[PDB]
């Protein structure tokens, strides 16, 4: 009786939200951006190839200096690369080799990683002893660790396969806030540039916008037909793009609270593993299962170019903070640095 | 390069030397994925042979790395394992269909199209008692078991009841029939009849892995 009545009210509320989104859908992003000129053909060459990983690369993250990057592979090795010289700055042996994510702290003093061991390990890069050591092991998730991102040297956000995201206090080792509401495994998260909000994508084909300080879900974005694997904030923080197994990328707007544009092609039938934006946000770069990385025009939903330099799945990619280059990681154990030429 | 850059490069080349040392250990160690159910008894088999409960054992100067877990997302990590050790309990007839559906997902998985499955039908000693007692009938769960006859190629152990052999091979046929449905020779199932207290379980994985490795080499030489 009461349960049946309540679940009917939820359907009414869902229709109310859908009508509200339809009310403000006066125009389409495609119509708005029809007049603007196309970006042309985007040609990028492999400037560097980082070799040394002996297994599938699953994650990489640039440092804020746009020169050092950390990559994680399931050979149990975290490696920090000097991208200008391809020098290996550090080689961090992981206690658990099943790593799925890695993050570089904005200060550059710490790196984080974690995977099927359900632990987010924090590594101190600046010690008087001259070696990288574990500073914290963040326990508390009941599923595999899928993504992690530093807010500062003391705070980190982790998303797990136990359908929850958590905000952690690194100094005390306890999670101050737990973010619940996803009904599937959360696969990715992205921090807003001001680090006051973050979006997470799960396998329930939905993206939720969370307030870090308040600790609740502000908005929920649906529209995907399969699991979301990747998510990335727009550089101004007012939008984000997702990538799912349905071979589509969607651009959601926070303030309009709905999808604005879909990035799909008839030839593309494989899942998407990673997404990122260029510094100006005009380019949306997505990694695919078909061994390729397609660069999309974010405004016009046109495939601007292709980065074809890997012999296995493109598992991760990222664009530097200064926008100079993009790195792509792959299951073939190589990292490549890409940029264009005049 | 300046004076410090050359020293930095020297640091980089010593890291590469350490990565090479760890590479040789990586290839010489075989990675095995262990899958099954709660009552499958897989935890007993791995313990006897000695989140992710990893066990390393060495047989005939060959290192085996077996990851016991206990899934559409975290199964992509085990894409390059040599073999998947799938364990079921043949005694429980009620959950066999659940195991068959579970086995179908593993075999037909998109990321497991080139991984051979070393299937284990655990607790054969318990299965014999259940068939010998006759209290539970397999035909209740599997109607096609009534029209099933033991093939002449069957090789039962000495002192084995022919009724058990007819029931034992029917369970295997259901799993094998799923294996031959698709795959086209990319991966091969290797069913076995093991028990918890069996001390030969290590070698059954060893011989099957040797055949799995051998079949990988023969595809390279034949340019398949």
């Amino acid at each position: 009786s009461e349960l049946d009545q309540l679940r009917q009210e939820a359907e009414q509320l869902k229709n109310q939200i859908r009508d509200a989104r339809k009310a403000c859908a006066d125009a389409t992003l495609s119509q708005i951006t029809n007049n603007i000129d196309p970006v042309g053909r985007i040609q990028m060459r492999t400037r560097r190839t980082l070799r040394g990983h002996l297994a599938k690369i699953y994650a990489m993250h640039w440092g804020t200096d746009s020169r050092l990057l950390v990559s994680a592979s399931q050979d149990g090795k975290l490696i920090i690369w000097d991208s200008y010289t391809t020098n290996k700055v550090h080689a961090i042996p992981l206690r658990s080799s099943w790593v799925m994510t890695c993050a570089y702290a904005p200060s550059g003093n710490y790196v984080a990683c974690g995977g099927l061991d359900n632990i987010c390990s924090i590594y101190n890069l600046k010690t008087r002893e001259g070696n990288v050591r574990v500073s914290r092991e963040l326990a508390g998730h009941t599923g595999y660790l899928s993504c992690c991102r530093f807010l500062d040297d003391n705070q980190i956000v982790t998303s797990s396969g136990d359908t929850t995201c958590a905000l952690w206090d690194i100094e005390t080792g306890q999670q101050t806030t737990t973010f619940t509401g996803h009904t599937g495994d959360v696969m990715s998260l992205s921090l807003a540039p001001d680090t006051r909000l973050f979006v997470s994508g799960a396998c329930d084909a939905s993206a939720k916008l969370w307030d870090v300080r308040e600790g609740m879900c502000r908005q929920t974005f649906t529209g995907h037909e399969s699991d979301i694997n990747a998510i990335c904030f727009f550089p101004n923080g007012n939008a984000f793009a997702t990538g799912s197994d349905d071979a589509t990328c969607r651009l959601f707007d926070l303030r309009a609270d709905q999808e604005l544009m879909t990035y799909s092609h008839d030839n593309i039938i494989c899942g998407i593993t990673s997404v990122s934006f260029s510094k100006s946000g005009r380019l949306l770069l997505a990694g695919y299962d078909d061994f390729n990385c397609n660069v999309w025009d974010a405004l016009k939903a046109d495939r601007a170019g292709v980065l074809a330099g890997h012999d296995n799945r493109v598992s991760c990619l990222g664009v530097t903070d200064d926008g100079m280059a993009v790195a792509t990681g792959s299951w073939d154990s190589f990292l490549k640095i890409w940029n264009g030429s005049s | 390069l300046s004076a410090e850059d050359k020293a930095a490069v020297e640091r980089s080349k010593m890291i590469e030397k350490q990565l090479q040392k760890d590479k040789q250990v990586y290839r010489r160690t075989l990675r095995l994925l262990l899958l099954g159910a709660d009552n499958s008894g897989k935890s007993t088999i791995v313990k006897q042979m000695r989140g992710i409960f990893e066990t390393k054992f060495q047989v005939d100067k060959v290192n085996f790395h077996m990851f016991d877990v206990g899934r559409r997302k975290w199964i992509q990590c085990f894409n390059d394992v040599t073999a998947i050790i799938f364990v079921v309990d043949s005694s429980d007839y009620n959950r066999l269909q659940e195991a068959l559906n579970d086995f179908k997902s593993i075999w037909n998985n998109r990321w497991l199209r080139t991984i051979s499955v070393i299937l284990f039908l655990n607790k054969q000693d318990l299965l014999a008692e259940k068939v010998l007692a006759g209290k539970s009938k397999i035909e209740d769960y599997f109607p096609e078991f009534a029209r099933y006859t033991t093939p002449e190629d069957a090789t039962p152990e000495p002192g084995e009841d022919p009724r058990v052999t007819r029931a034992k091979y029917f369970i295997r046929k259901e799993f094998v029939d799923i294996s031959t449905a698709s795959g086209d020779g990319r991966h091969i199932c290797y069913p076995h009849f093991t028990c918890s207290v069996d001390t030969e379980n290590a070698r059954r994985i060893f011989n099957d892995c040797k055949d799995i490795i051998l079949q990988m080499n023969l595809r390279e030489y034949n340019l398949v």
Partner: single-chain antibody
Amino acid sequence: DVQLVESGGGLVQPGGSRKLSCSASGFAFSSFGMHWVRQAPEKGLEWVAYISSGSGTIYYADTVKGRFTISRDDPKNTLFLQMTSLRSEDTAMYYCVRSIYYYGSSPFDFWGQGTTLTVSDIVMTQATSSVPVTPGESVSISCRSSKSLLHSNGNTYLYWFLQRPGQSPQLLIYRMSNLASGVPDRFSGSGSGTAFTLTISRLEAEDVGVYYCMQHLEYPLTFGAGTKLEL
């Protein structure tokens, strides 16, 4: 904590041989390159030898090349310096210095206490030998180099050290602008090309000492004469 203790020094006859040892504790010794730096009594610092991590690269100063041998024992965390044909010019305090080299590292960050031995090229110039100072007042120290220390990669390989009376040198500024860990922010290094300035705002009693500028552009590493601050 990071420690570097030298031993084996003492009074030796001219033309003799002596073996100096440097025991390291509290840090990953095998990951660090090691230098020997000596300082003659009432004189400045003089670089002696360098052995890299992994023992692959070894450099010597010309004044000691062929007579001194530098070696390390990574399992025992001991640094060695075998000396032969000792002259009266070798009478000095010998310092054991650690230095690690990767992008963003701070070489020469820790020095040992030193051992005393008694026997019976880019030019770095510090023209101002002494500077009278008062507490709380800003002081600037100038250093000059015969060659431009700015490399094509953007680094300017100029190091600033401070040797308080009775103490071992401490790193203040590495690569001409960066401030070493544990050093107060009042120290600031500014330079361009061949001319460099070390500015010390709000001088204190602890800052009193001799300041050395060192170049790390190429071997042999050379030190300036040194500028002494006195009250």
